[PDB]
Design a binder for this molecule. Structure first.
Ligand SMILES: [Cl-]
Ligand SMILES: [Cl-]
Length: 164
């Protein structure tokens, strides 16, 4: 197991433009296209991202390429964020993947907002952080996914993803 596999399980893969859990136009492996209510605006963002007239449909290879870029950007966003960097640096490899997953899903800003949990993770107070992480809209809106990530932070193993 690794970050790619982990996110591929959490996000799935869809070649046509679809609406995510929040109703936003997305494509491929969780690649958010726009928060605008306009399908055309979405088609437009997809073409600009891929570099061709897609007509709202990507190929597998294109999706995978977007995915690689997105993971890369998530990591780099973490390393450049003064509140995130220090946490990431203190964590072991498995837990780091947990933090990347959250950033990919909610953006650097969103995650940096979990002040209390971040402090707990930095201090290595696993059970406590897990409880605090769960008191969030994130957990209430996407509980199955949130549980997988939280277990990952709690245990430091890939147990929640083995079976998937
Ligand atoms: Cl892009
Ligand atoms: Cl979920």
């Amino acid at each position: 197991m690794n970050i790619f596999e982990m996110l591929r399980i959490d996000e799935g893969l869809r070649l046509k433009i679809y609406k995510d859990t929040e109703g936003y136009y997305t494509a491929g492996i969780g690649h958010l296209l726009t928060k605008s209510p306009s399908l055309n605006a979405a088609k437009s963002e997809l073409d600009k991202a891929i570099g061709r007239n897609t007509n709202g449909v990507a190929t597998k290879d294109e999706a995978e390429k977007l995915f690689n870029q997105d993971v890369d950007a998530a990591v780099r966003g973490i390393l450049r964020n003064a509140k995130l960097k220090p946490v990431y640096d203190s964590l072991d490899a498995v837990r780091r993947a947990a933090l990347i997953n959250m950033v990919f899903q909610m953006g650097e800003t969103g995650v940096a907002g979990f002040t209390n949990s971040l402090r707990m993770l930095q201090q290595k107070r696993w059970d406590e952080a897990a409880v605090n992480l769960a008191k969030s809209r994130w957990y209430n809106q996407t509980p199955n996914r949130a549980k997988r990530v939280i277990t990952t932070f709690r245990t430091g193993t890939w147990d929640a993803y083995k079976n998937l």
